[PDB]
Amino acid sequence: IEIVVRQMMKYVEVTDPGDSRLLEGQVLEKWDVEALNERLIAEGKTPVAWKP
Amino acid sequence: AEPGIDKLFGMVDSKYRLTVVVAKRAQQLLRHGFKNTVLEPEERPKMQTLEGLFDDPNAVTWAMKELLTGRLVFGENLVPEDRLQKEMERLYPV
Amino acid sequence: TSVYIEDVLHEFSTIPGVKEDVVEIILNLKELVVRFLNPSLQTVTLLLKAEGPKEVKARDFLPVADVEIMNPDLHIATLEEGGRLNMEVRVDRGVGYVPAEKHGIKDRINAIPVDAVFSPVRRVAFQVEDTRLGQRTDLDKLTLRIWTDGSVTPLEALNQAVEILREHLTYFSNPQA
Amino acid sequence: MEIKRFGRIREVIPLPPLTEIQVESYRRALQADVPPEKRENVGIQAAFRETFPIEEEGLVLDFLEYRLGEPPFPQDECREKDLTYQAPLYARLQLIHKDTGLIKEDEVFLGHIPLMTEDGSFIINGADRVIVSQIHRSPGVYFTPDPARPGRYIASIIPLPKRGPWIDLEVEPNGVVSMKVNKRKFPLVLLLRVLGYDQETLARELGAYGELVQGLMDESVFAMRPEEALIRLFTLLRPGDPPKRDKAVAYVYGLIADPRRYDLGEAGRYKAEEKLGIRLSGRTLARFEDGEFKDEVFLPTLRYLFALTAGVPGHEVDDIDHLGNRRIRTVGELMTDQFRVGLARLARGVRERMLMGSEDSLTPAKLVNSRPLEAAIREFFSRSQLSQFKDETNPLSSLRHKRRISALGPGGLTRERAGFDVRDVHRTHYGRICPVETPEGANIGLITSLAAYARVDELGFIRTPYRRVVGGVVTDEVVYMTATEEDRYTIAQANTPLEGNRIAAERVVARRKGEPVIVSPEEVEFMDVSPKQVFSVNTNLIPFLEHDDANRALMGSNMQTQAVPLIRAQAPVVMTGLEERVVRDSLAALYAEEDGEVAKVDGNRIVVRYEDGRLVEYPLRRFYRSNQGTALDQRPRVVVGQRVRKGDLLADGPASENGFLALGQNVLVAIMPFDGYNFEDAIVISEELLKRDFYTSIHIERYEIEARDTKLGPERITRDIPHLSEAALRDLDEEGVVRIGAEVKPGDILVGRTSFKGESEPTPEERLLRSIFGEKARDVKDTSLRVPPGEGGIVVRTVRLRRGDPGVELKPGVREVVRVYVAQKRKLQVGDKLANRHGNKGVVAKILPVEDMPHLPDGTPVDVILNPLGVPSRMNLGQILETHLGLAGYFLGQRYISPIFDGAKEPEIKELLAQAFEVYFGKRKGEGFGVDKREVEVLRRAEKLGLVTPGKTPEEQLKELFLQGKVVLYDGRTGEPIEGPIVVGQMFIMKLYHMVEDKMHARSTGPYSLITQQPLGGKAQFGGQRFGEMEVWALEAYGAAHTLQEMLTLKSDDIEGRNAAYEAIIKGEDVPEPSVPESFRVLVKELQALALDVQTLDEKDNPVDIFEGLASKR
Amino acid sequence: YYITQVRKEKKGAGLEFATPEEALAAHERGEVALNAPIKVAGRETSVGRLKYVFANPDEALLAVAHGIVDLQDVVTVRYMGKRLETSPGRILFARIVAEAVEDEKVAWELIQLDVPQEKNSLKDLVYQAFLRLGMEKTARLLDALKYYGFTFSTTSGITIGIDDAVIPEEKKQYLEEADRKLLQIEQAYEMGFLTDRERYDQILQLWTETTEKVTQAVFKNFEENYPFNPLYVMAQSGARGNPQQIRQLCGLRGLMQKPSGETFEVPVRSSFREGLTVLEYFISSHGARKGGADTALRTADSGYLTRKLVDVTHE
DNA sequence: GCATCCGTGAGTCGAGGGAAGCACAATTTAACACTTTTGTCAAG
DNA sequence: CTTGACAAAAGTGTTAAATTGTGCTATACTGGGAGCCGTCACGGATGC
Ligand SMILES: [Mg+2]
Ligand SMILES: [Mg+2]
Ligand SMILES: [Mg+2]
């Protein structure tokens, strides 16, 4: 059940694009936005704000 | 159950690695006509036929028994595939 | 074991002038009890030639040497006027139940194999009573009751069973080790 | 073997003809015997009087009468030549030229009407078929509550199926009553005005309820003339068409006033008059007369709706599942409906032909084209859902199939779109539809069976009989009555005690509107005829039904249909009393027409001399193959010179013993576990059953081959097949067909056929082979018919139909057809399915020798061993009581008739068991035998279990055990007794049609699909096993990646992969690595056909060609 | 379960003595039964444990073979150096497990000797064997258990008769009490102290309470008077059946629901052994059809959910 | 807040299921004497 | 290993015959017809 719920909670929604090309309200995967955020922090850019 | 199945499962970190090793050893045994076996003549698997006892034709049984004996080395990046096949052909012509 | 009826190719057919079909006639024949008076006799063929109108029974078979029909009153078929029954019944000697699909005996082209139940013994029971002898009261009284079709008497069947058990007990004599 | 009858309920009336629902309905539909001038306006006569006269409007085609001729061929000839048993239908028609006033009359051949056989079935294309009756919502006027909004009601006017649109009347929140037709809502005010209704009329009639009439007083259109109101309504119903008076009046008249397009039906009209308290002149919502529309039902419907909304005491909502609101379309009504559709198409053709051509020089024969009528009729009798392949495994199977009622079919519900409500057992099913008999699964509740005493009336409503009760005495007056009429009376139960005819019990269990109540004898108005009327024919054949759970009684009744006839079939020891009636009404057995003497008895015919002196010869159906392959033969049961009375049995039909239904064998059953061979419903049987040919059936298989015309030459059915030895052709006769009586095994030739080979040069290796052996390639190849794997038997019949034979309508290009009937005698074997009437079923898992089976102390072995653990979970205790009564009868040499819910009770069974023990132990005592030592041990154990009373003698304890149905049973393997007494009795067990012989199938390689190249499916096609999605999921969960890849590629559709794998295996090598499946290539090509660029890439995103360069343009 | 369940007697059941010789002598006189719980001097024992003291399982099973004692008789056995007081059936089960696993000590540590072997105990034994030994020995133990269970269920004498569905004497009294309470409720309703809905609820509660009491009475009768009853043994061991089905066979069928969902005021007071009436059978048909339709329409929903779950977590 | 539109609804198995002419121009096919090549048989 | 014919199976032109494709017919004719509720129920998404 936890595996299935983990699949259920796999996605997030953008609230503030920050210094990225994403759109506010866009739905993507949590891993993708986390990787994008860490990359943006790597070169000193505004992180993407997301919502579970 | 297969004989010594618990020991076979305990000899590897993942059961699918055990299956891969057994299948690859069985294919090696089939390709060279069981002449590359590490089993002594008293250890070769046998089947009862109307004529009499003969060598077991099932290579998976031979591979499992060989893996039980512990004279086989299994792992990743041991030897190059081409070199391994060439040396196995040279030592065991077929 | 086998039956051949003239002008009949298989058992799934009906004979003109005969009330019963060949399946029913074969079923009736399966209840025929034949006793061989010669121990060396292994196979007999009984010929039956009947013309209607009559009730052809087991007593209408032609007499054969060293062969007896233990149930002459067994009903075989009912022949209507204008009907004829010419048939040959091959009776073999054997042991156990051999289906017609196993032996497959056909004396001729149109012979019909018949499932053969060679066992003459119809029923066996045995009864144990609390007999007493002397001062001990735990003894057993054994009573074997044997019902047989009549071809083999119950005493003969008991003797054969005892001999078979003795022969099988002799198999424990020579150890192969 | 005497029969002892139990029960106290005296049935006043016998069971009605069980097939009357088919026979009477079709007789009414056809009316072939009543003279034309006395024919009533029903059935195809009604269809003729409805579609005719045909007027172009001065050509008028009037219908005067019709007649049905004798069938061209008899039923046997139709079956043998694959024909349809039908009668020619001619119509007498006159063409009137209104201009000249001249009439020309001639008889036109309208076609062929399929005929119903005496048993109630049809022969369509040589195959027996049954038209299953369809239950549906009766037409009429209904008033249902609105679910979205409480306190509101909606009125539905429903015509006959495909005979007009449903009419919805709903009081909207605004207050305007809205009429919904054809998904379109409009104000009912407009149509009500179109029907010549003014404001004062509405205020006077519907104005006595409240504001509801005020919602129907819109004066914006009341003053508007009826003509413009009609045009406005026409604009509402179909917007866009140019508003014209003629078109609009035609459309409205067709929608609500045309008898030829709107038909409320006789049942619908009757229900409308009964509910609304009015009298319809016709069967239409309105009448069109004097150039104006007159209302028939809209005002009464709206008045009832308004009064119901107001809350008058006398008006109530309608339960749409109430069986008084649900009606039955039998074979007659369905055939009449399809005949009317075909007649309407024919009328269209006749109208279009009289428009053209010389109106002066026209005859009724030229105008009438009967092809559409024949097309509609053949479509109904062949490709209809309700026209089902007849189920004739045994006579009970056909009897059930003729009494089945299906909610599905054209005009009914859908298997998946049907909810729980339509599938539930309504309270009105009591006595009309069997509650327990229904196919479990997707069709539960959708298909049911007519009750035993139930009959469908003229209008299609199922009626059940009740005995009139007046003043406390139950009279012999029986009233057949419907559910809506049944709801008005207090109906007692058939088991109510009676002192003669007076009701003796002070408290009577009764039903009031389906609810159980306790009433006084003076409050009872009707009584049930018998407990049998509640259940169908199949369920009435289950003794001790009151001790079986309904879920298992369902299974037992369903499996009674699947039992195969046996060569030694015998009627059950415990019967219910319907076996004789089932055999008699199935028309499988033969009975004497009147008193007489039998003149000739033969396996093929019975010739009887009746009292009047006429010789009557009845041929006997011998070894006939049913639709399911079972052998249906009649065996004579009389002798020459025997005196027979009227109705006396002459010959048993299939599955009948002396006129009693015999679906199986009566076997000695011990209820006890046995070495795990009884595990999970498995059954253990003795070899003695096979020795004396019990559960042995005869099955006939039909193999068909055709010799055809081909461009290369004609296929020849000949014995000279190229490249075959004499051993293969040994059993073939000179004509190339297998000789009758030959024993054929799988791979043996039935009919030898050679076909011309396609012109194609051989492969060079074949050419070199032929040159080496010096053998010239022949022009023909073996295409002969051989026995499929797992089949065979004895060739019992050969039928050869040739082109030009009388009545043989072969398809074009087919020179001849040969059919081989091969009969095999199947004995009971491991994997065969046995069952009993109480829902206990299982496959034979072990066949023991006689010396291994448990045996009685007298030496009698048991025949079947059943696992007791199947009893507690299933709660079918009727099998236990049947076993006890069977033990009693077995030792008493008698059979029993115990009717369901009124029959043998436990005290009676125990007294019978006391008599049985008396004989069974008196035999032992007279023979000079006491009590066994091992019997004493079992008695000691039993008194430790409290089964027998301590302190009694061993004989008395054995008697107690026998009265409990248990005996001291011995183990044939050890000779020691079973430690506890075992329930041993005689039980009736049926051998079902499901046999492992017809179900075992295996395949290595075989045919493949055309597109996907995957293996076909089905044992008949030698197909593979479907490895669906869930199996793939199981392999993925196991982690068997390579097994999954093999099943997906190497064994299904990798053409190169499968070829290489087979070649490697036959060479003793390991199968190669698989490749891309052909299904993926098909997927890619289809996606490309959808203009989608699907490209397979590599690690470096470069395209990878999976088509081997065969689709790349250079 | 049949071999590992012990016998209980009632003949003696309580007499006290001074010396074991007096208890024995009372046993040969027929005053006390073999398995009846008695007190010798201060301790509570049985005649079986004193009369039959076996030096090893071999002697106990030899005595069983000679008919001296049964597998269910509680006797004293010297096993693994301990003077156990168990039945030869339980000692036999211990030997079965020991020979299946080829280790006496581990098998002794794996089993619960002092209880009959129901489904749960056997499942725990299989799990512990899997933990301690592996797949091979667990499969061997499973095969041994299968063999011995089949053999003993065959030779034991389990059968289903009409009298095996014992009707408790308490059912008639409970039905009379329910009828009297129903008459009292009807009188109260005629007096107007309660409305239709609460009267219907009280009727339902009364009939549910009566059904529960009848179930308890059925199972109490089984566990007191017929501990080896086939229905009771099958239910207790977990082989087949549940208390509801045993009640329907032995007690009363109970309340049934209308097709709309409402329960009929009158229950089905007759069981399957007594036989339902036509009206009661028709009433039960509603629930049977409802259950069948529910099962028919539940498979599609379950399969569709399973496919959704597969396709969301397949990766 | 509701209205409308759309896609979804277990698996395996079997069993039978299976307005029309009429004239005329092109075009294709069949057939038919003739030249071939293609096998053979004869000796050198 | 070669010519030196030669029966024959194959290939090659025209032709008469079926076979197939196309045009044309002159009283006047000028907007279809099968539809038809146990409308399947219920979430998800769009969009007014
Ligand atoms: Mg015999
Ligand atoms: Mg079904
Ligand atoms: Mg002692």
Which secondary-structure class do the elements of chain B indicate?
mainly alpha
Q: Which CATH top level class of the largest domain in chain D fits?
A: Alpha Beta
Biggest chain pair contact, residues each? D-E, 77 and 61 residues
Biggest sheet of chain D, open or closed, and with what strands and sense? 7 strands, mixed
Distance between the termini of chain D: 90 Å
Give the number of domains of chain D: 6
The number of helices of chain D is 31
CATH architecture of chain B: Alpha-Beta Complex
Shape of chain D: globular
- Cα radius of gyration of chain D in angstroms: 36 Å
**Order of strands in the sheet with the most strands of chain B?**
1-2
Assign an overall shape of chain B. flat
User: How much strand of chain B?
Assistant: 5-15%
What is the fold-level CATH name, i.e. the topology of the largest domain in chain D? Answer: Rna Polymerase Beta Subunit, Chain: C,domain 2
How many discrete structural domains of chain B? Answer: 1
Ends distance of chain B: 34 Å
Classify the fold: give the CATH topology of chain B.
Answer: Eukaryotic RPB6 RNA polymerase subunit
**Biggest sheet architecture of chain B:** 2 strands, antiparallel
Keywords (chain B): DNA-directed RNA polymerase, Nucleotidyltransferase, Transcription, Transferase
Subunit structure (chain B): The RNAP catalytic core consists of 2 alpha, 1 beta, 1 beta' and 1 omega subunit. When a sigma factor is associated with the core the holoenzyme is formed, which can initiate transcription.
Function (chain B): Promotes RNA polymerase assembly. Latches the N- and C-terminal regions of the beta' subunit thereby facilitating its interaction with the beta and alpha subunits.
Protein name (chain B): DNA-directed RNA polymerase subunit omega
